[PDB]
Amino acid sequence: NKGDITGYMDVAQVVLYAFWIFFAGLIIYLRREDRREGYPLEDAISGKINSLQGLGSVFSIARPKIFKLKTGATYAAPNFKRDAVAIKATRTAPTAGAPFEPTGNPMTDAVGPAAYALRDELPDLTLGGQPAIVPLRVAPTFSVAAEDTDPRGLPVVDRKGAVAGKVTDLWIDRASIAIRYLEVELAATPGRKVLLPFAATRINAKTKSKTVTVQSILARHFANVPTIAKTDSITRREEDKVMAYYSSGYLYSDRV
Amino acid sequence: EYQNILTGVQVRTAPHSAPIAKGIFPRLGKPGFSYWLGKIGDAQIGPIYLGTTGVLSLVFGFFAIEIIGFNLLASVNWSPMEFGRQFFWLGLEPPAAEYGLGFAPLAEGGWWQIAGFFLTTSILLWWVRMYRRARALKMGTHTAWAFASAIFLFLSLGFIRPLLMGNFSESVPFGIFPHLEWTNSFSLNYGNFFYNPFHMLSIAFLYGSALLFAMHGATILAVSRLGGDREVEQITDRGTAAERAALFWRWTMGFNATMESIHRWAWWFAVLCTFTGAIGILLTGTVVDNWFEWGVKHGLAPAP
Amino acid sequence: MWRIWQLFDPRQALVGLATFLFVLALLIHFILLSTERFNWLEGASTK
Amino acid sequence: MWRIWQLFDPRQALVGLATFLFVLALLIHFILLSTERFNWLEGASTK
Amino acid sequence: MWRIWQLFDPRQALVGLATFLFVLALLIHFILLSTERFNWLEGASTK
Amino acid sequence: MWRIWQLFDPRQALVGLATFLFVLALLIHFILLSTERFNWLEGASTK
Amino acid sequence: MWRIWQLFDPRQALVGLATFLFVLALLIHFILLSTERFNWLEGASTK
Amino acid sequence: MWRIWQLFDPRQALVGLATFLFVLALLIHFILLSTERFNWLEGASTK
Amino acid sequence: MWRIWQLFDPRQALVGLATFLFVLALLIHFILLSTERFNWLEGASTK
Amino acid sequence: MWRIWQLFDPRQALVGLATFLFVLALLIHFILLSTERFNWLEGASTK
Amino acid sequence: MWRIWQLFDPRQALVGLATFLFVLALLIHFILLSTERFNWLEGASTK
Amino acid sequence: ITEGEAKEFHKIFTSSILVFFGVAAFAHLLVWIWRPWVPGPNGYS
Amino acid sequence: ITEGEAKEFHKIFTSSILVFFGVAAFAHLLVWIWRPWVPGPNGYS
Amino acid sequence: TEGEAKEFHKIFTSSILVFFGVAAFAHLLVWIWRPWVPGPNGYS
Amino acid sequence: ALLSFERKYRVRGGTLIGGDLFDFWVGPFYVGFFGVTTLLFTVLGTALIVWGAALGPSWTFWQISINPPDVSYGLAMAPMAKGGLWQIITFSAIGAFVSWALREVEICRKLGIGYHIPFAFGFAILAYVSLVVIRPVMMGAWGYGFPYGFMTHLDWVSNTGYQYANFHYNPAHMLGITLFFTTCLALALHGSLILSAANPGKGEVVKGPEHENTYFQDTIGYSVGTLGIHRVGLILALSAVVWSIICMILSGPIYTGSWPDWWLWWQKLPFWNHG
Ligand code: 07D
Ligand SMILES: CCc1c(C)c2cc3nc(cc4[nH]c(c(CCC(=O)OC/C=C(\C)CC/C=C(\C)CC/C=C(\C)CCC=C(C)C)c4C)c4c5nc(cc1[nH]2)C(C)=C5C(=O)[C@@H]4C(=O)OC)C(C)=C3C(C)=O
Ligand SMILES: COC(C)(C)C\C=C/C(C)=C/C=C/C(C)=C/C=C/C(C)=C/C=C\C=C(C)\C=C\C=C(C)\C=C\C=C(C)\C=C\CC(C)(C)OC
Ligand SMILES: CCCCCCCCCCCCO[C@@H]1O[C@H](CO)[C@@H](O[C@H]2O[C@H](CO)[C@@H](O)[C@H](O)[C@H]2O)[C@H](O)[C@H]1O
Ligand SMILES: CCCCCCCCCCCCO[C@@H]1O[C@H](CO)[C@@H](O[C@H]2O[C@H](CO)[C@@H](O)[C@H](O)[C@H]2O)[C@H](O)[C@H]1O
């Protein structure tokens, strides 16, 4: 009557169907944006570019958008830079859906939860073109705020209670003011130094004494933590490697 | 077992900010630090930028708020006690039907119209402020358009639908309980606002926004041990945090987003929540008198 | 008096003054429009 | 038109055709089922 | 006029055109189904 | 026709086809059950 | 007026023009459908 | 047909098939309990 | 007056002015359709 | 009063002035339309 | 009893005492204003 | 896939699909015998 | 922008604005001939 | 700069005056059509 | 069928139950024991929903409804024809949700990430359980749960809301609405800030965390931080769900009257109870 267009069809229904068309287009756009990393898909066994995909393939992958960096650098998304098919693991079954048996110590072989993305060897930059993740020694201005336990010199122990080492230095992000890493000197090897992510620590400020505990890896696992080069500025690949190694603890912290 | 839900150890440094052209106005606010905010997020407070558009928006908004509060206090004969008693029930009511879209007497809705105009102007000037602040920092204006969606819903509720009906009588009052009562009576007058399909779409997108911002928050907190909280850096250089975030949802759900595109989903769900809502508000009364009868006609109801 | 601009930046003073005067004038015109006597467009009779 | 397979991979065209024609067959069947005349399950009278 | 295909990938153009044409055809068919006169399934009389 | 398995893996084809056939059979059985004439459980007279 | 394409990308401008024209045409068609006089599906009388 | 176990591992396909069979059997029993003739617990008369 | 394009880029100025003019034209047309006298689709009598 | 441009920036001042003038023009036009005497689109009788 | 002042510095102690006493005075005065007998402003009769 | 198994798989698939189609056809024939599903121009008298 | 291309853009922009204003003025004159939009003292009719 | 302010003001004032002249002509025409200051007995 | 980086984390282990039996993938999905169980419950519940649609009079997707048993049955199991099907679908839905969350736990262990996502999903499962189990049990009948239907569960929402004559006046409902709206606003702001930082315009190199902090320091006066924003967003959504659960437990099990006149307590505090 008042709002109809043709007998049964009215304005509200037409606007609804217009929204449905727009939402289908928006879903297509959002899925195109989603398919900007890890695409196109590879075969599970051989690794050839194959996938059960229809007429939407032409619309599935977007043209590489270009990200500009404040160093002259550039990222392409999608960049069709893929991983090698042969990893340090073997198929439990040759059925393309089976999982992988690691063929070694997966902590130091970067297999599974220990696997780290193959990033670039450049530290995160600040607004001034300098490394963002730095030790507190080479950032005199930065200081640990009061009313919080200072995690310097506290014993670093695992869940079993064994004192893995001692913390000497804190590594912090300059871009976002927060602690990133604790520098830990090994009680077993003074000549060895490791980085333990701050996200992997408990404050433990409420106990008989003050200590730093880690629930992921055991004390001996601190003897194989990946090392870094500059000791005062850490690249993205190095930090990603260290975090992946520490995060691999929970799955297989007691052998494989 | 740490979770990155609270920051046990905080860091405090010399406050600093990205460089902007000086302009007519400087940065204002003598930045300080707070402890609970630093426990949940960053600790620094301010400084707030107050440009020409900022001054304009603040003046218009303050004028509107003072008009609204003066009217609310005057409605209870300036009694602070009785103002406390009725504060939730107090409301600046819109002008009646007979006055159309013209100026009503101040007591009969003129103050409501003046306050609504000043509030609309301040909100639009705040939108311009968000746009200009994003452009000044050499950034994109996604926040401005996300805000424009909400402004569309606000103007549809307060101004656009009155324009279409030629009448401010059915606009929403300036009160705590009165605006809820407006919501209830608007739904009742137009037949079970559940049967509005754009209301259903808006509820779907509100539920989806909560769902998405729980999924995404929990995902980033789950990969925060892997540098996953540093989302823009994982967007420009994909780390293993982003890879595991994608693979979790790919294995549990069949598909996944990018660290960049998940926020496109986040943007669009929030924007659509209010876009469909504004459309549904603009459609009621003008095109669809009774949403229950529309639902009966179109198969949403069992046709009593 | 002559040094009022040695404490206030003339750009900020002018912008704030213009904003306040514009909003106040708009408010006054709106209030007169909301009257049976000073609404010059409705033009209701004095008597 | 034998050349269109230079543009369209046979796997992609075949999967897309399968899905599209299945959905269209469902749609047409459901439309027929919602009609008074061609709903072959209740078999309502023509006259 | 043969130059348009230098602007657009023929796969993109063809798939998009097929999508647009099918959606438009579905739209028109449903609009006709909504009318009393052109609905061929209930077939209301012309009179 | 046998070249179809040079496009499609047989294992995933079998599992997907089994799932699709089972869902279709469930759908048709349920549709018949909702039908007055073809509900073999309620069993109303066809006369 | 041939220098406009030195400012606007022919592909992007042509796509945007096509989409804008399609939406405008669709809206005009639905507006005419809404009116009594120009609805060509019901076909109401001029008088 | 003895070769099907090359396509599907018995140790897991068997358990998945057992789960599917249990679901189907329990669904059919629920459907029968929902009826009026084949509900052996209600035991409603056929006459 | 040619120096104004010194301050403003021809391309952004063109797109902004184009959108502004189209939106204003749409608004004026919708206003006219809202008025009884100037609705050319309903065609109400001048009397 | 030529030094008014030695304080503020011509480009931002011009865009702000154009936006403000257009918004004020829209507001005055809308107010006039909302009045019976000065609504030039509706039939406006002086008496 | 003077030993209070080496745990509570007089700055915070006195500001807290001032806020507490002022809030309590406001409370008691308002409570009296809510009662008819003691509302010294409305001044309802004792009887 | 290796073509050396496609010959066997297609023959098994063809045999099984004909078996499935024949069983379905016999079931449809039985249902039609019990109750046909194509009404005449009066309904289901 | 470069002053040399600024002159050319200003020239042909001025021509285009003249064209748009002329077409719009013709449209307004046609509408006014059809139905004027400035009412008289006693309304319209 | 401030040197360009002279020419900017030279053209800005001419634009101000032409815009104001068009606006004033519009106001004069509207006042002929319908003046907007009512008298003691309202409008007539 | 794998992402460019997928065939590196597809290791075994990380499963709570099943050992190596179901530790595999089907297409993109990980199955596990709890994927099998969520298929078990989903297939059965969906089949029962379609069966109730067949027993229903519509087949109209928006008019298909599974109703809970009438309140005259109390907390008793109901006959499948009249009420029992809703109960079985409820139990199947609970089992499927729990299986989904547990499968998410296994995936989290396999990828070595935190268990935040299944914990957050636990709140949605709890909201559903409070709506179909906890509240009906406290109220004493299964007929206080909502029907499983597209538009009929909205009829349930409206009927129960107007049972207390205005359900807006439920203060826990006000707080849940505030949290939901604030979650939507915060999600809009966060997605917008991330997109604007990643896509700053022509030229316009990608901005860092300092630019993102500066934007909201200038516009609002405070910036939460690129890590704390996900914290506050997850807490906002979970708290919205918690306060919705609270407002629905308060209505019926605890409060059985008009919510609007619950607020008279506020009207009659002793320092303005003018009487
Ligand atoms: C008896 C009531 C009846 C009942 C049936 C029912 C029930 C439900 N509903 Mg509904 N609702 C009914 C009526 C009804 N409902 C809505 C709206 C929604 C949307 C709002 C989205 C939003 O974010 O809004 C909120 C966003 C706005 C209003 C837009 C942005 C606001 C801005 C920028 C304000 C800026 C402010 C300042 C700067 C501050 C200073 C100003 C001052 C001091 C004055 C959302 C999806 C939503 C949800 C649900 C659910 C979940 C349910 C359940 C579970 O039952 N409802 C609005 C709408 O869009 O409708 C299409 C609307 O107008 C309207 C009406 C009349
Ligand atoms: C996707 C849809 C989503 C939905 C669900 C959603 C809902 C609601 N969003 C709501 C409120 C606001 N939203 C905002 C801002 C505007 C501020 C304003 O207008 O100030 C302009 C007004 C005023 C100036 C008037 C008063 C002023 C006061 C109280 C101060 C007076 C005193 C003074 C000046 C003196 C003292 C101080 C000195 C310094 C001297 C407010 C807080 C904004 C945004 N929403 C977005 C989106 C969404 N908003 C996005 C993307 C945003 C922005 O960009 C923008 C912003 O700044 O966000 C941080 C409300 C009430 C909502 C509900 C539920 O109803
Ligand atoms: C700082 O304050 C101190 C004094 C403490 C206290 C002051 C004030 C107080 C206590 C204020 C409290 C205010 C409250 C409780 C406000 C509640 C507000 C709510 C909930 C509002 C909710 C919705 C209202 C909306 C959405 C209204 C929208 C109205 C609009 C958009 C109207 C626009 C109208 C226009 C543009 C009118 C045009 C017509 C004319 C011709 C008049 O325009 C010139
Ligand atoms: C008329 C009815 C009521 C509506 C209010 C109309 C007046 C208020 C809105 C006018 C339009 C504002 O539009 C905006 O104006 C301000 C100046 O004021 C300008 O912006 C200016 O202030 C900003 C503040 O961040 C500074 O960077 C700089 O001093 C300058 O750019 C913008 O370039 C213009 O986009
Ligand atoms: C996987 C197997 C799928 C099998 C699918 C089989 C599809 C075809 C089945 C129906 C074939 C047609 O079947 C035929 O239909 C005509 C209607 O024109 C009917 O015709 C017969 O019955 C009707 C009344 O019921 C009489 O009016 C008519 O005179 C008589 O000849 C019969 O029902 C049958 O003779």
Ligand SMILES: CCCCCCCCCCCCO[C@@H]1O[C@H](CO)[C@@H](O[C@H]2O[C@H](CO)[C@@H](O)[C@H](O)[C@H]2O)[C@H](O)[C@H]1O
């Ligand atoms: C360039 C494109 C855009 C162009 C926009 C410009 C449009 C200008 C329109 C108004 C111009 C003035 O138009 C003039 O108005 C006067 C009122 O003062 C009208 O007034 C005259 O005609 C009306 C018609 O009913 C009589 O009732 C009235 O007594 C008489 O004075 C004239 O008929 C008209 O010629």
Ligand SMILES: CCCCCCCCCCCCO[C@@H]1O[C@H](CO)[C@@H](O[C@H]2O[C@H](CO)[C@@H](O)[C@H](O)[C@H]2O)[C@H](O)[C@H]1O
């Ligand atoms: C940039 C634009 C600037 C616009 C400036 C506008 C200035 C306004 C000038 C007002 C001139 C006064 O002109 C005088 O006013 C009186 C009221 O006092 C009005 O009085 C007259 O009109 C009214 C109403 O139509 C009637 O009662 C009667 O016809 C007569 O009294 C007339 O209009 C005129 O006689």
Ligand SMILES: [Fe+3]
């Ligand atoms: Fe994020």
